[PDB]
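PROTEIN DATA CARD
Card holder: Calcium uniporter protein, mitochondrial
Chain length: 95
Origin: Homo sapiens
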Amino acid sequence: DDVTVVYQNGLPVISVRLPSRRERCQFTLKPISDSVGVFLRQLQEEDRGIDRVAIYSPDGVRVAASTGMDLLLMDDFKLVINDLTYHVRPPKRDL
Ligand SMILES: [Mg+2]
Ligand SMILES: [Mg+2]
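Structure generated from the sequence above:
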């Protein structure tokens, strides 16, 4: 039921269950040009049931929206969607 990150054709695909449906949904991101803020906006656009979304470091520090997805994906992070927190573990890719 978690959030997964899987590279397909060289790009990260992030799959998540959103609050309003059981059908999981996947988001493909461009690491070098998309930011954290872009991903969060896509989540909100996909599900109007989302009131709150944010990404945190494993230590619980909020990640800036302008941070590139490539930088975020170098390590674990937390994704908060409404009242649920997901621990996300991306595969270690160089930089
Ligand atoms: Mg995935
Ligand atoms: Mg991280």
